[PDB]
């Protein structure tokens, strides 16, 4: 399974992300693989191991 | 004992529907054993008519009388005679004291007043206490009727006692 | 026929992007600085601006 | 944890002046938003011709209570209470209330009064503030509208005209009422319709189907108390079928179907009873301010 | 953290009243000017069919005073009646005294397990018995390890069957008189299980036979009635 | 102050208490009269006219009867299928023999054997718990089953490409094992029954999987039936009586009242849920506490 | 007191911390209440029987302790026993929507009919099962239907309890249906029904003589749809218990004011006793909902 963390932590690169539909559109009508949403500030980043 | 009050209070709610009296009953080692008394699930019971076969069925006669015909498909008249079977009987109230006890002596220590013409010392090593009831069809009664008891247990199987209704009423009915 | 006409209305609704003119300086909004208070929970701590 | 309430309307400076008085009191609101509109603020929202007290009662039951805390230019701060911590709450209650009481709130009953909540309104808007009332009182009150429920249906004879009129008229200490009658225009509305037929036809059930259920459970090991139950049911059977005729023929066989309805019918009418059925209490109070204009009372739920 | 609660009490019943472990329960009169008085719960004791005859006796002699006097004339008034009448408000930290928002009789204390349970519960309990002549109201004071109100009062029913019939036996003998429930089952909070320390009592040169419950926390409950 | 019926039903107490007996005087149990029984209020009358008891005693003897009849009923079958060959049995069960043994003295003991079957038959025997599954409603609905499963046409190839794929492999017999020398007969067998591979012979076994090995015994005789109430009386040497269980002459109501396997009520201790496992049996103690 | 500390006989590889690390501020049930505790009578795998009996479970469960779970750091869990009154958040992975307004209560888990039957925690034999958080209307729904099961199916053989059970044990609440495993009866079971018959009866017998026959006035007056289910019901119920013509009524003689507050308040309290067997106490009374359904933050 596809650790988030280490997206959320690593240092990416800046794209101007353009796509014509909205983001909720594109992600509850399930066009990508595997998503990963939280709402809020999930702290699940924080822990390493 | 804690039946037999209740069983009397049911059977006098329910006169008026199948004028059935009341049977408080008794039974000790000399019936059943221990082992079928400490697991004892319930106790069935039927009035059976002298003439007539029961009083769930038809009273005059039934069609169940044409003989079974050894048929595969259906074996003995279909579910139709299992489920007038399972309408032929009744089921009574039921308790079971497991420690050895004298009746004159427990009732004894139940608030009863017992009251016998003389103390007969009959003991007993486990008492179940049952109440049937049989039923008078007018309010006259016969004689020659005849009550079934079934005792079913946990595992399926079951046994039979039945008698004619006269010989629990030999000096008690003579004596009204 | 029962002997009576039946006159049928309806709804509709349709989706109309309209557009709007103004004069220059037509209304005139006042701000401020916004405030903030801090709504605190367990694991979070939520701030309504 | 504090929220925002705003106005759209314009207010005087002697609106709030008006408004101000009611500095710490209870009001609802449906849900917790950060910054709500006061057209959600207090029970207008509800308040109708054609609904009545029960449904006040029953989303009242839900609706979140706040005590209202500071007034603004054009804004209030309400601040919503916690469990266990005191606070004030001023008595806007038409009750007098003593140290020790317990207090739950009741949808008020002077709908449009005399007073007009002391003339705090709006353009097709009265603020309209919910009762806080001890809660013996509170239950008590409920059953004499329940019982002014059943009798309105008989209105046709006086004696039953003279125990409503009893029934208007409360008794507490220093505190009388004239309650209203729920039936208006030879009519009772619907939520004490459906409440009080609800409340009868479970007794009717009940009445109905306790003698086969408490047969069906004392098939087996039997006590004294089911004994003493049949032994009521019978007293009830010998004080109730003297009149009726002889040979009702009820059989102790019925499809599964009939007592299953029976019994879900029957729990989901005693189920909409509850909202009215307990009352849960919400204050109690440590301390009552003089001339009982206030209170310092901690809250409960 | 404690709430304070400041009261005015006369003296005719700081008797058994100036240690910390007591308390206060403001119960509607039937006099109408005070409208409420304060009372003990060892007033409670006195009244009370559980109890021995000794510490009635007791009681008696420590309360011979008029405020007592009408206070057991105002709770004799209604038949079972207390439980729409009686209303606690905490226990007393110090004697005109303070409460918040632990002593009690060896006799009314009871238990339904081995009390080795860590968290331990108390509970009010009053019992209406109707085989007396009218009304037989037995307290108690139970310490227990269970949380759940409602297995709390299906093992009351079950250690209370005797209440319970008698309940109904005066419910199918007296028609016209209709009881409205058994008793009342209330919390009060919660101690751990090393304090309960049974142990001695003199006050007003009097004797008592106590138990004392140290690190009572406490918490007011509703008075759920319960048949 | 109305007395509660409790109050007086207790101090009202017992008149009498006596013993009664069954029919068969096997079972004593006592009955109790209490006076304040509405029994006693009622004032019901009472007579015994005998040709009542006399239609009493003739349906309860043919109440008895009806399973006593029906081994009478098996016994002349044999009687009339062996008068019917002619007398020379042939073998359906798996066991071989001996030429030079002579079959005359196991002939005699066949004939020895069933004569003590017929004086030691019962209620409980083989055929009885052969057939007292069959009278079960689920016996009606296999059978039903069973009729159409065994009478399929042949399938077609489209559902052997497409449709979903078909399934009997033992039968539960019941016996009668009747020991000559020691005289004792057997009433409850329980008894697997399969065929050969090789040959279309049958083979006993018991119900933990062991080969029942009482056929070559010579001075034994046994009786089989089956869940379908054919019929099997083997003497060693696995040569076979064999038959169909005759009941024609008995009446449907006395046979389905007189015995018959009985469909549980719902207790404590069992799964609302059907066929769930069970739970522990409620076992009230003479040992233990009440509690 | 309030930080209690479990532990682990085993060691949790990258996959274990993983799993669990998404399990934050889950509630467990811990039986004990104490410090020091040990991770086999965590939650219910110890008390978890299949054909035992679901009110059991449901019994012990609303009598044990509940806690929060945060910050697992490797062989550790800090489960945190909430305190009464204050704002928490809770995270559910029992397959039900939720709402902002309503309340909670905590139930044995039903299987939802996909069967995962993976929690997401195993050590060996051992599993982690854990309680259904439940919103109070489908709590005290799945509660009711449990005591008719039980009070419908005594004296009864199994093809009409079957086909009563086939349709009673099934619950769609709210776009998810919801099937119970274990019906099977029990003497806690059978006290309730006595408790339940007990009160049935008082409010059977103290009940007014008007109520007793208000509905067939109100049906005499008037005729609305619920109404004409109502007189279907109490007519079928009627012709069940005689096939004589109900009378109409007529003036009530005894009227008392005091009469119908007194017998109205017992009947209420015997309301309340009756249904304080399905009505259980809430314990999380909704501040936030996420929307994705995953978590809340609830006021207790």
């Known amino acids: ?49 | 004992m804690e039946t037999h009050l209740y069983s009397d209070l049911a059977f006098e709610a329910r006169f008026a529907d199948d004028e059935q009296l009341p049977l408080h009953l008794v039974l000790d080692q000399e019936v059943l054993s221990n082992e079928e008394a400490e697991t004892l699930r319930y106790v069935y019971y039927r009035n059976v008519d002298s003439a007539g076969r029961s009083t769930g069925r038809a009273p005059g006669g039934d069609e169940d009388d044409a003989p079974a015909s050894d048929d595969a498909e259906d074996a003995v008249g279909g579910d139709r005679a299992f489920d007038r079977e399972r309408r032929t009987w009744q089921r009574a109230c039921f308790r079971v004291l497991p420690r050895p006890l004298e009746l004159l002596d427990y009732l004894r220590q139940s608030g009863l007043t017992v009251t016998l013409e003389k103390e007969q010392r009959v003991r007993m090593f486990y008492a179940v206490f049952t109440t049937l009831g049989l039923r008078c069809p007018d309010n006259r009664l016969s004689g020659a009727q005849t009550l079934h008891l079934r005792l079913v247990w946990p595992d399926g199987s079951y046994r039979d006692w039945e008698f004619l209704a006269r010989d629990l009423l030999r000096e008690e009915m003579e004596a009204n | 026929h029962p002997g009576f006409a039946l006159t049928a209305v309806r709804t509709d609704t349709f989706e109309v992007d309209m557009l709007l003119y103004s004069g220059k300086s037509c209304t005139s909004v006042i701000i401020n600085n916004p405030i903030v208070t801090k709504e605190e929970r367990d694991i979070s701590t939520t701030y309504h601006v | 944890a504090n929220i925002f309430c705003t106005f759209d309307h314009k207010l005087s400076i002697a609106d709030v002046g008006k408004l101000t008085k009611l500095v710490a009191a209870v009001v609802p609101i449906p849900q917790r938003l950060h910054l709500i509109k006061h057209y959600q603020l207090g029970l207008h929202q509800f308040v109708d011709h054609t609904r009545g007290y029960v449904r006040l009662r029953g989303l009242l039951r839900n609706m979140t209570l706040t005590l209202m805390r500071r007034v603004e230019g054009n804004q209030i701060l309400l601040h919503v209470p916690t469990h266990g911590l005191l606070y004030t709450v001023l008595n806007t209650g038409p009750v007098t209330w003593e140290k020790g009481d317990a207090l739950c709130v009741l949808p008020p009953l002077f709908h449009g009064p005399l007073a007009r909540e002391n003339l705090l309104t709006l353009g097709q808007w009265e603020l309209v503030l919910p009762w806080i009332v001890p809660m013996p009182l509170a239950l008590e009150i409920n059953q004499r509208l329940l019982i002014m429920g059943l009798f309105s249906l008989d209105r046709s004879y006086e004696e039953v005209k003279a125990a409503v009129q009893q029934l208007q008229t409360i008794t507490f200490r220093d505190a009388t009422f004239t309650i209203p009658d729920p039936v208006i225009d030879q009519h009772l509305l619907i939520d004490m319709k459906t409440a009080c037929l609800s409340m009868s036809m479970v007794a009717n059930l009940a009445s109905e189907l306790t003698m086969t259920y408490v047969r069906k459970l004392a098939l087996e090991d039997s006590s004294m108390l089911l004994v003493k139950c049949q032994e009521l049911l019978m007293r009830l059977d010998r004080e109730r079928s003297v009149g009726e005729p002889r040979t009702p023929a009820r059989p102790q066989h019925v499809s599964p179907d009939d007592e299953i309805a029976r019994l879900s019918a029957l729990f989901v009418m005693l189920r909409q009873l509850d909202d009215l059925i307990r009352e849960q209490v919400v204050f109690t109070v440590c301390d009552v301010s003089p001339d009982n204009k206030s209170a310092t009372c901690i809250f409960k739920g | 953290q404690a709430l304070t609660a400041r009261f005015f009490v006369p003296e005719g019943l700081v008797e058994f009243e100036a240690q910390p472990g007591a308390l206060l329960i403001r119960m509607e009169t039937g006099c109408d000017s005070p409208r409420h008085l304060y009372i003990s719960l060892y007033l409670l004791g006195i009244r009370a069919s559980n109890v021995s005859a000794s510490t009635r006796c007791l009681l008696e002699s420590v309360y011979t005073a008029s405020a007592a006097r009408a206070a057991l004339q105002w709770l004799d008034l209604g038949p079972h009646l207390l439980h729409r009448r009686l209303e606690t408000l905490g226990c007393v930290k110090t004697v005109l005294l303070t409460c918040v928002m632990l002593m009690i009789p060896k006799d009314m204390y009871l238990t339904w397990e081995e009390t080795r349970g860590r968290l331990q519960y108390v509970y009010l309990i009053i019992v209406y018995d109707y085989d007396g002549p009218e009304t037989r109201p037995g307290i108690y004071v139970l310490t227990s390890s269970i949380a759940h109100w409602q297995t709390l009062v299906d093992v009351a029913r079950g250690k209370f069957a005797r209440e319970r019939c008698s309940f109904v036996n005066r419910r199918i003998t007296r028609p016209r008189q209709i009881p409205l429930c058994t008793g009342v089952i209330q919390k009060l909070g919660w101690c751990l299980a090393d304090d309960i320390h049974t142990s001695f009592l003199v006050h007003k040169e009097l004797k008592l036979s106590v138990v004392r419950l140290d690190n009572f926390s406490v918490e007011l409950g509703d008075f759920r009635e319960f048949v | 102050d109305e007395v509660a019926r409790t109050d007086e039903w207790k101090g009202a107490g017992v008149s009498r208490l006596r013993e009664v007996w069954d029919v068969q005087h096997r079972v004593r149990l006592r009955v109790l009269w209490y006076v304040n029984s509405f029994w006693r209020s009622r004032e019901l009358s009472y007579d015994d006219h005998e040709v009542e008891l006399y239609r009493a005693l003739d349906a309860y003897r043919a109440r008895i009867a009806v399973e006593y009849v029906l081994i009478r009923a098996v016994r002349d079958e044999i009687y009339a299928v062996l008068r019917r060959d002619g007398g020379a049995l042939p073998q359906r069960f798996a066991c071989h023999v001996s030429r030079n043994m002579s079959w005359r003295v196991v002939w005699e003991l066949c004939r020895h054997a069933l004569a003590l079957w017929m004086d030691w038959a019962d209620v409980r025997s083989c055929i009885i718990k052969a057939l007292t599954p069959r009278l079960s409603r689920g016996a009606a609905a296999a059978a039903q089953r069973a009729r159409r499963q065994r009478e399929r046409s042949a399938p077609k190839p489209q559902e052997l490409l497409f449709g979903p794929r078909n399934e009997p492999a033992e039968q539960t017999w019941y016996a009668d094992v009747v020991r000559c020398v020691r005289a004792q007969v057997d009433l409850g067998v329980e008894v697997r029954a399969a065929r050969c591979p090789r040959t279309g012979l049958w083979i006993v076994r018991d119900r933990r999987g062991r080969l029942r090995r009482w056929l070559s015994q010579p001075e034994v005789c046994v009786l089989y039936v089956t869940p379908d109430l054919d019929f099997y009386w083997v003497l060693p040497g696995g040569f076979a009586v064999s038959s169909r269980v005759t009941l024609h002459g008995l009446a449907q109501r006395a046979l389905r009242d007189r015995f018959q396997n009985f469909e549980a009520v719902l207790a404590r201790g069992m799964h609302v849920e059907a066929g769930r496992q069970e739970p522990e049996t409620p076992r009230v103690s003479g040992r233990r506490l009440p509690f």
């Open chain 1, 1 to 49: 399974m596809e650790n988030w963390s280490a997206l959320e932590l690593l240092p990416k690169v800046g794209i101007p992300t353009d796509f014509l539909t909205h983001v909720k559109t594109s992600a509850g009508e399930e066009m990508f693989e595997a998503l990963r949403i939280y709402y809020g500030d999930d702290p699940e980043r924080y822990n390493i191991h």
